[PDB]
Paper text:
The orthosteric ligand-binding site is located at the subunit interface in the ECD, composed of loops A, B and C from the principal subunit and D, E and F from the complementary subunit. We implemented a modified human ρ1 GABAA receptor construct (ρ1-EM) with truncated loops in the N-terminus and intracellular domain and an inserted fluorescent protein to facilitate expression while largely preserving wild-type function.
Our cryo-EM dataset collected with GABOB contained particles in both partially-locked and desensitized states. In the presence of the agonist GABOB, one class (13% of resolved particles) corresponded to the desensitized state previously reported with GABA27. Consistent with our previous structure with GABA27, the desensitized state with GABOB exhibited further lockdown of loop C (4.3 Å S264-Cα translation) and rotation between the ECD and TMD (7.3°) relative to the partially-locked state. Interestingly, although all structures in this work contained ligands in the extracellular orthosteric site, local resolution in the ECD was relatively higher in the GABOB-desensitized state; in resting and partially-locked structures, resolution was similar between the domains, suggesting that channel activation is associated with both stabilization of the ECD and mobilization of the TMD. Densities for GABOB were clearly resolved in both the partially-locked and desensitized states. As in medical practice, we used a racemic mixture in our experiments, such that our cryo-EM densities likely contained both forms; indeed, either (R)- or (S)-GABOB could be modeled into the ligand density in either structure.
Numbering used by the authors:
A (entry chain D), B (entry chain C), C (entry chain B), D (entry chain E), E (entry chain A): 78 to 377, 451 to 479
Write the structure that this text describes.
């Protein structure tokens, strides 16, 4: 039906003349995973192309579109899109190549394929884990400059659809939209580039329950010492030491999961402030013990330091929490 | 025998006319693995197709079906099924492609292949680990709409068989069955979709023995303090502190295995209630020590608080367990 | 030499007539790994096929066998064996495909290839780690029923050889042998199936030294308490608590390595019995302390409980060990 | 257009005569990851080739360059570059091969491709983590010696461009530049080799906060003992022991992450010196207890050892830190 | 130039007559990694072949060798070497297949390729980590017996070269050399086999510092108890218990890294002897406490046991170390 043997498909339509326009639209099937250690995400989508080539015209009386097997895609000419700044990708091939080709009697062509991509995304963790991130996926032609191929969104802002099943267990997904920009390479020229943009927001419940509550409970345990007879030395000393030693484990367990950045995160501040709060309660009792021994040496109830600590330590911690949650909201 | 050189197999049977019907049936060989962190499962199965094409007719006197090598599959026309919402898949190829082709003298065709698939499954962990999940595998044609191809289960509900060897170490598998539904894509049209459905139920014995028993034993250890002379301060203080510090480790060891969901699970409730039960026994003795020191200061047996705690703490824990196992059964 | 252009190799020898017999023999090169979490093993072997096809006859005066390059395998007809219930496999291809083809002047053919397979194996862990497992590898034709192809072991029981280098660090390997059985699929018919069977036995030394000895040592540490003055409360209390808290870690470290089965293993019994032995020694001293305080209240040496515990606890543990190693031998 | 059927492209241009010159230039897209355990890095780049072949001449009036599909690359002759000392690499192929071919009417050719490489890099950890590393990527022709192919940087030092987005979370990247050298293989001859060089510098903030601070805090905790009444034996003994036991965990947690080198690293020195500082404070109190018991035996305030330790231990640690940070800056 | 269309390259040179000799030589580029858990190593090398075939003769006046593209390798005949007892391998293919072909006017051929291999190696850990291992890589023809192909090292012992960059962070590499042996398969015949042999020696510094020193320090901590007043029960009891409990962690941390062998390693002996040394110091004080209580009961300084332990325990440990390092050197 299609006159495939007649023509040299190594050359584009309009070869030697003005640029060929090619339109694009997209449907996202899933957003698959995200990594902070590697700074990347994975996405699966359907991608579609539109153009006209009169070498693929055929006669009919119905003026309708026809579908063809799919093994003809490797005989005709086809555009050459690639994903910019991507780590890896593939096209699906079970039970056969997931490819579709439809042609109109005047030579208009529709071409579609299903693909999975993993792409680069630079992340900022200064407000972690109360953070927000923004991402994009880039599309461009490899071989042809804007003097030979013209690339655009087919229907404007309506060119992007999203599956209603899309979900991530740790993030809220929002603000899908599309943009365009021109790009330059020194050795080869100017190119059109298409963008798909979106925003992510992290859920905090896991981190409350797994980090912020136990640190608070250790701080509250250290306060119990102020309520115990100053004469019970082998009770008051280990009570403080054990809380110091636990707070160290919590600090280690948090930071072992993240990338080794060169700046402080919002969770680090909270944990290290709680550490100094616990550390100071040990020096307090050391002072009380020394001053009591001096009194014994002079001579040979509740001490004022205990009496004041019972008020001062909790008030200070409450002030710190008010400030912190005013800053990070 | 088969006139393969005579015809253009880029076009379907009945091209330009009414839709071709294609029937399907399936046998599941194994259900291979399941992930909560990734929310997916893996399955291996045999998949079969049935249709008629008169371009593949041949003469004989016996009216019987014949089997052909398998290298002819890439010369003739073949339907184009794909698995919807799937992460990855392949066809087996040792010692050769695991493919079968049988043809009748009137052009009826039987086509079979062996495949492994990994597929998406959304999971709810609010009753974990006493939870039940339901899953499905989706089948659809990539290129042809319901105006060109008609897809149906060959024998109705009898179209699905299951291997007697199928098993999972952590789940009971039940309720295999098949359904159909129509699907719409904005840019390309209407399609028939086939479903395979099943249900999973988790075994709880591992979690009893590995989580619920040790937390109970820590709670029962904290009660021993009420039976010890109030004068033995360096004994009664560490006995409580060490149980608090162990309960924290159990809490951490559980949640380090699961996805970071934004809601509380049924096991979290039990562990955090046990934590507060243990935490309170430390404040109890702090109160007894303070009140004894006040009595000493005034002046200068078993305390009522101990006497009452010996009854109140165990009764409250038993009430809590009755309620909990009434709710989660 | 071979008349390859003359014939249609899409059709088997004797197409349209009685079944073709095909003989098989095997040499195992290595048994590569085993997984309890995944319930599978990996094997590498050489696999050989024997049949006659008169379309491959050629003239000679010597009546001897000749070897051919190997690129002819994709032109002639070849049998279609696959491994049943397998997870994955491949054929080796460095520096070229590891394939061999030899032909006799009357058309007798010998065909060989090297392959690696990973296969399913259901395992029972009720006597773990003193357990024994049995495994098998299954071989069958994909497309041809017993009416068209007949599959058998070439030399009877002599058809299976094993490399003298085969070894596993954790198991003793024994009892290699071969069997045959007929198989039925509802939609497609009856098939011949060949089996390779073997047995595995686990070495226990690692588990003695890494699990059973330290649990025993914790139990023996708990007994030291009975030998210490009942007046040293802050010594006798932590001595018991610390052993409870260590035994919990041993229990956790064992079960974190295995699949989450729904039944008790032989190592679980030992560890949980040792746990209760240690748990009881804490209640013992609690009783002694309470009864001493009652005597003080009445009034205002070694206690009989200590005196009896010094005999009763070790005797009971020794009785338990005699029974256990009588049952699991 | 191009006379591809006319010529034998198994032979290079100028076959049997002087060497063909081939020029190269490069743009780096990303530096992807680095491993100390494996001693390697990963890089993604665009690579370009320039040469003339008169068998690819064609007539035109415009004297301009033309772009061709890309399926012609496997028909014509093309240079054979490989990456020396590399572990693995691939060329990107979605949605098609990422390859470009441009030709001028006189037969000048431009050839480009996108690739990812993982390459060997020998590392020195004697000043870890205050260390600096230098790396390079090597390029060479596989089959042709300098008598048949001549390989050079196209534009001198201007032949290397770098993407402005390039970043690593743990390193500062600096000093990109290019060099050339001749290489010899005994069996096959002399070859031209091109180099791409760069330098890396590690950020230290993570290691301060995660290793050096907690070790210092343990040392400062051990000093508190000198301020406590020498009569409180069950307080002063555990205070020292627990710090020894914590310092061991820090030492283990650091070295579990790195390769098992045969020499001491700069972080090892700090940690083991802090260990001996803590170890000595236990022997100190042992001495005080023994000497006090001797005084009791003779007979039957603050001891001079405590009085002097309160000054000597901190001064010594401060001297050690001054020296250390003078050496490692 | 080469008459490729004239001949049947499915047949070897001298087909039907005496065996063809094929010579080999090798250059090792890198030794990439080693695993004790899997018992294997990985190697990358260049491999070369030499033979004569008069079907590849061509006329010239210069009598020199010529290089050809590399796409002709799949048209001519080529030998069929494979690596015996190997787990996996591949040939490098970026930017093209890393293959070289050179031919002389009389039909002498040189063939080269670059490859990476992973190979089996049986290891003995009875003297671990002071152990020495020996390894080899095996080379053989798949399809042709010694009656049809003759395989030998081209230049004798000079056939093996090694890159000066080769290094491993944990081993000293020594004693590279080559051997030959004949091999028999029951079903198929006799074959020539080539060997590459080498030796490895482990560096011990990591294990000194990470295992042997801390165990010694725990033993020395247990001795401090003998220097403390026998009346300080809550000090002397935990001092011993905590060292027992730490030594258990060291024992576990070592053996969690290695394969689960059925025999004792040299490091196990040291650690378990140190364990009993620490265990005995607890029974010592238990005895002293009991005997003191008996003296109190009779009645109603330093004990001889302490006095003797202060000499006996260290002397015994020093004797043990002398013997151990005399045996394992
Ligand atoms: C759906 C559609 O666009 N149909 C048109 C039809 O209305 C028109 O009469 C014909 C003329 O060729 O072209 C086609
Ligand atoms: C967020 C975004 O890119 N929105 C685009 C925007 O460029 C434009 O303003 C709008 C028309 O009003 O169409 C849409
Ligand atoms: C198994 C089967 O269906 N056999 C039928 C046979 O009964 C019938 O006589 C024949 C007529 O062509 O067609 C075939
Ligand atoms: C569970 C399920 O899908 N069962 C199907 C159902 O649709 C139908 O009701 C039944 C006929 O009674 O056939 C079967
Ligand atoms: C090894 C073997 O079987 N050789 C036989 C030979 O003994 C016999 O004389 C000949 C007749 O064609 O066939 C061949
Ligand atoms: C273990 C096993 O399968 N052995 C087979 C068996 O079937 C048969 O009894 C024997 C002949 O005596 O040949 C062999
Ligand atoms: C951009 C460029 O180099 N253009 C030149 C043009 O200036 C010159 O007149 C012509 C002669 O053939 O060759 C071409
Ligand atoms: C760092 C480096 O390689 N720089 C090169 C160098 O070889 C040369 O000195 C310079 C010219 O001044 O060109 C550039
Ligand atoms: C390098 C070498 O071997 N060159 C020889 C040359 O000496 C000899 O004169 C010629 C005769 O054909 O063969 C060639
Ligand atoms: C270690 C080794 O294999 N060395 C070989 C050896 O077989 C032989 O003794 C020597 C000649 O003296 O050549 C070399
Ligand atoms: C880490 C040094 C701690 C010193 C404590 C001094 C207390 C003095 C009380 C007057
Ligand atoms: C965490 C603060 C604990 C305060 C305990 C107060 C006890 C008062 C007893 C009357
Ligand atoms: C967990 C509850 C423990 C109760 C101990 C009671 C001892 C009574 C001795 C007569
Ligand atoms: C590890 C041996 C410790 C010995 C301490 C001796 C102290 C003597 C004080 C005079
Ligand atoms: C594990 C049993 C320990 C028994 C200690 C007995 C000491 C007796 C001293 C005479
Ligand atoms: C102690 C944790 C407090 C968490 C407050 C969160 C406010 C949104
Ligand atoms: C940008 C630094 C914020 C630090 C705030 C500290 C709140 C107590
Ligand atoms: C302490 C755990 C109790 C578990 C009860 C389970 C009831 C089915
Ligand atoms: C849906 C919340 C259930 C909480 C029940 C608490 C049982 C003590
Ligand atoms: C305490 C462990 C005893 C192990 C006995 C094993 C008997 C074969
Ligand atoms: C099948 C259960 C065996 C339990 C034996 C217990 C031995 C003390
Ligand atoms: C206690 C850590 C001190 C770190 C000093 C770093 C100086 C650049
Ligand atoms: C090259 C060894 C440096 C050691 C310096 C020690 C500083 C206290
Ligand atoms: C305490 C460890 C001693 C190590 C001695 C090593 C002798 C080569
Ligand atoms: C082969 C056993 C060696 C054991 C030596 C023990 C040294 C104290
Ligand atoms: N748009 C792709 C680039 O032009 C590739 C290159 O720079 O070679
Ligand atoms: N049924 C497959 C879809 O039609 C693919 C697409 O939307 O392009
Ligand atoms: N023996 C292979 C089976 O017949 C395959 C199938 O059931 O389709
Ligand atoms: N430049 C590549 C080397 O010549 C390859 C080999 O030595 O065979
Ligand atoms: N040398 C390879 C072996 O002959 C292969 C086989 O035994 O089939
Ligand atoms: C940005 C610095 C914050 C530090 C608070 C301790
Ligand atoms: C004390 C916690 C209050 C924080 C409110 C955001
Ligand atoms: C759904 C909330 C339950 C919380 C019980 C503490
Ligand atoms: C106290 C446990 C009983 C729960 C019964 C389901
Ligand atoms: C099979 C049950 C055994 C349980 C022993 C405690
Ligand atoms: C007490 C251990 C003896 C067990 C013998 C099998
Ligand atoms: C290079 C040796 C340094 C050791 C310092 C303790
Ligand atoms: C005591 C820390 C000072 C180090 C300055 C580099
Ligand atoms: C080979 C046995 C050695 C055991 C030493 C305790
Ligand atoms: C006490 C350690 C000496 C060992 C010498 C090899
Ligand atoms: Cl005490
Ligand atoms: Cl204590």
């Amino acid at each position: 039906l299609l006159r495939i043997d007649d023509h040299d498909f190594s050359m584009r339509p309009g070869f030697g003349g003005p640029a060929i326009p090619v339109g694009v639209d997209v449907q996202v099937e899933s957003l698959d995973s995200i990594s902070e250690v590697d700074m990347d995400f994975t996405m699966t989508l359907y991608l579609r192309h539109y153009w006209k080539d009169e070498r693929l015209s055929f006669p009919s009386t119905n003026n309708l579109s026809m579908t063809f097997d799919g093994r003809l895609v490797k005989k005709i000419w086809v555009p050459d899109m690639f994903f910019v700044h991507s780590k890896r990708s593939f096209i699906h091939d079970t039970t056969t190549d997931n490819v579709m080709l439809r042609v109109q009697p005047d030579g208009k062509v529709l071409y579609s394929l299903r693909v999975t991509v993993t792409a680069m995304c630079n992340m900022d963790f200064s407000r972690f884990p109360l953070d927000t991130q923004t991402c994009s996926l880039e599309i461009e032609s490899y071989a042809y400059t804007e003097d030979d191929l013209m690339l655009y969104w087919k229907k404007g802002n309506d060119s992007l659809k999203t599956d209603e099943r899309i979900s991530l267990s740790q993030f809220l997904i929002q603000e899908f939209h599309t943009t365009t920009k021109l790009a330059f390479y020194s050795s080869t020229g100017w190119y059109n580039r298409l963008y798909i943009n979106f925003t992510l927001r992290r859920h905090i419940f896991f981190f409350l329950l797994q980090t912020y509550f136990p640190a608070t409970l250790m701080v509250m345990l250290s306060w119990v010492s102020f309520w115990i007879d100053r004469r019970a030395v082998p009770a008051r000393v280990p009570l403080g030491i054990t809380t110091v030693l636990t707070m160290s484990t919590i600090i280690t367990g948090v930071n072992a999961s993240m990338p080794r950045v060169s700046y402080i995160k919002a969770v680090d501040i909270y944990l290290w402030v709680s550490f100094v709060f616990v550390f100071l309660s040990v020096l307090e009792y050391a002072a009380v013990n020394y001053l009591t021994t001096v009194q014994e040496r002079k001579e040979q109830d509740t001490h004022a330091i205990d009496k004041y600590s019972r008020i001062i330590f909790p008030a200070a911690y409450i002030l710190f929490n008010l400030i912190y949650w005013s800053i990070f909201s």
